[PDB]
């Protein structure tokens, strides 16, 4: 098996659209791996640019199509280049960009932390021909930076594993195991925006519910508490477009339903006392 | 007729946009089928990658264009590879991705269950040359997993049928029958989010309608009930973007119109009692 | 002139986005037309798939580029195939998909009916070389089906006309007439959703205006009628995104402005009676 | 310099999205220009379709890439054809479609009129080789028609000018002048929709402000005027998505701020009279 | 190293979508650089258009792929041309368009000023072969113009720096330094729209809070102040879609939370005085 020494450069991480569960990562991929030595023009290494390596592939050169697994859509590769050292090593430097997906739970919506993953796997070849030797993620551009609401703390952890696919077992009997790469970028939500803008005014609405508890006119209590329902109905509209369609409850919608429950408790209390 | 032994690997199912009736499925397609034996380089099987099989097709090799029927748009195939075993078998492994469509009724919107289908059919050849032998959907990645609000329960059922198209009958008199593949993935809506977030506060609004029934000031009853109309008007706005444009009624809009009817019943009752 | 016997298969009609005046139609196009006989391999007809007919076109084969006229954007053709019968007939079966546009008036918005048209025309050739012989729209998939709010009643009517373009008259003196195809699919809005969800609650708001006519406290009448303005302002917001930017009035915005006029009539009446 | 006799056919004008300053125009471009005579097959003119003229370009044929200047994005050309008359003239008929941009002021938002421009310019060649002879816009399809809210009155005016670019002066010393085409389609907003739907209910809100001026209970005056603020806050939400992000004021937001000023004048008057 | 004399023409700057941190810039790129002299047809310079320079690249011609760094997505190049002067100079004129990204803080949201940057860098070659000699941004089209809310004041500043990438150090030991270009266009938000439309009505709401401070009925004070909460809840909905998801506070959301704090101060004051 021909070992590949991959190394991923992360340039920017942006557009974490949690509504439909994706995030875009932009950067560079480097795939150094050894091969048969050849005679290049001069002692200088040979550089072949985009839309010219296809001639080399048709001429008989091998280059692996390192696809991504957790990507949605086609990863739109920009410029891509292919080193050809005379003594044997080949470097496949390409600029990758795609929308990547994680499971990415939201148990605590403002106090939130997940992992950004780039699950890389050879599409065509299995562990018998291509096995990934090592990976070093040189992510010095975003290693300690403040991007969007996602603070990237710590270095990017890496994994090299042998993942066996069973859907190729019917067509490949014993050679269907793949050398998979999984990097993990630890990212934490910055909760300053939500704490400043969404949570405290909900506390003010709950304080207004305490005020209508303190109110001293029963029909006017009912009128004010219906205005409270109008106030909480004013929520979860510019709020529903920031949390995803999610089966369990966050703390934000828990605060919304707690305000609804307190308001309804106030009205059921005053009606049951009136009757 | 040359038999094809297809096998579909389902990787991820995501983005079930019920508003305009689509869902995206991502995965791998494997099409094993026998052919004329050839002399490959060495005893090793021959691997041809993306944008290189076109040379083989121009050289005279046959490969079927297995299209999808329930797909909208072009299915953006990523990397695709073509085995060439020396003794005759050919494997066409490709990574497919497209937006697929089902009829997908919504008679019970939160308590909802449908089938995700991938209706596969040979585009160019009929039952006389290409007949699908068998399919085994090795969907072990999503067989029992919790994705979005869609819990995938049970294994993926399969069907092989002979579907006759009549629009080719005028140009092909007796040979216009197609061997069609229909897989069925049983999927159920998780109703936890809607039960927690939409249905119970509507019950609180109906309880507030009971409270304004209990109210003891006629002009103030009218004022509060108009605030109730404002409250129900606050619904079906962040709610109308989660159910599709659909001719009959769900239970959610049935609850909305029941709240409207109860509110109007309260007002017509108090006005008819006043007169 | 070489006659072409076209026949369009309609698969699905979806996504009638009336806001910016488009609708998507998906289906198959068949273009049977006779030509010079050739020697095909064997007595079997020759099948050439996608991205292989270009070699035949470069080799000297003629195939017409049947474009659409009422399409917006490029119609994204998927797989496309080209029969070659030995005795002379050629069949050009392709899968077309595009967003199509009609004038599509909305004089009665819920009680609405229009025609879906697919205006087909040869792009390159005029009536002297290519004249469309006949069309039979075999639309059995959507002939009597319930899609979205659009019930497709009746069969699809067809037209063959000779449309003369004047912009080619300066460059082609006497040969600038085109054999145009216009099919017409009669489609009717299903008014159940609007009658159930939008029109009747507006009647309830008008009944509340009758109630504030019945009210017996002048300052409280003014307060309630301003709450009525708040109620009608709550409309035409989730309503304005369902009707297009349209110069005249529908019946929905007529109901909105009638509610506004009744509310303002109530307030001007009570103010003029107060003064 | 080789003269080009261009003539643009306008098919449809649609999608004038004033929010981010664009409009789409669809139609046909015809570029007749003389060249070296050649021997075509027979006396019949030669027709070459899409994705086949590239062979002629590689064979040595000249064809200008007539780009657009005020276009945003790439103009997605559909089918395109190239005449080859034997005696010398060449006609380049193509179907262009793109999103075009004008400065397009909005000083009077409902009583609005602008010019739709299609600024055409040769990308590669300057005035020394390619000079546009004349243009006649045969826009008979939209010359007098009612599209969206834009009534197209009058014929489309044309301009031929020599525009000098200075960014090519450092690399081309004396030959950097371009023969530019600017057509102008005079378009006027139809103000019926805004006059019927937005302006008159604002007058009703101002009349309600007159009514709260007429009101006879000071605390109830304050309550009603705060409901007036709620009413005007209900505006500029479904209104802010119809006018662009624009530095000066239209008449619509002038009416909004005039309502705000009248409401605040009423409250400051009653508070200053109370004190 | 072969020096390159680049010069960027800026045509339009539009679509500064601050919500997800991007801005589009449209214009022309000119890359003049010397090379080996060749025999061109005649003394006239040779012009090669789009989709024809690939033949020259395959024939052995060198042309650099000048990529952008701060671009998101692929920059969709339109028409592109390549001069070939006989004595040696080569000019690579291309029309670039892409969405570019800056850090772009928003510490003062209406009183806002940032820099638009176009960070240009050779993708394939390092400082040993390609070093950028000089840049002159001939931006006379937008140098002093009023675009959107962004007034472009001053000329576009330029920078030429040697930026060393460390992710290529493992594969290139001593030759991994890149000659990077960074232009800076100084742009200032026009604050007229926000001052006219958002800030002053917030001052009117604060004045209404002063009015409810002046109010003389405690239950009616509570009712009015809850209507004030409804008024401020009416904000930050058509306001939240104009400022990005941002961790710290602007002055607009500071005004929103100051209104919330003043309203809650009023209610806590009247409740504590009542108790």
Residue numbers in the entry:
A (entry chain C), B (entry chain D), C (entry chain E), D (entry chain A), E (entry chain B): 11 to 285
How does the study describe this entry?
Here, we report cryo-EM structures of ELIC in liposomes where the ion channel is confirmed to be in resting, activated, and desensitized states. The structures of ELIC in liposomes have the same overall architecture as structures of ELIC or other pLGICs in nanodiscs, consisting of a homopentameric assembly around a central ion conduction pore. Each subunit consists of an ECD and TMD. Proteoliposomes were formed using a 2:1:1 molar ratio of POPC (1-palmitoyl-2-oleoyl-phosphatidylcholine):POPE (1-palmitoyl-2-oleoyl-phosphatidylethanolamine):POPG (1-palmitoyl-2-oleoyl-phosphatidylglycerol); these lipids are known to support ELIC activity, and phosphatidylethanolamine and phosphatidylglycerol are the two principal phospholipids found in gram-negative bacteria in which ELIC is expressed.
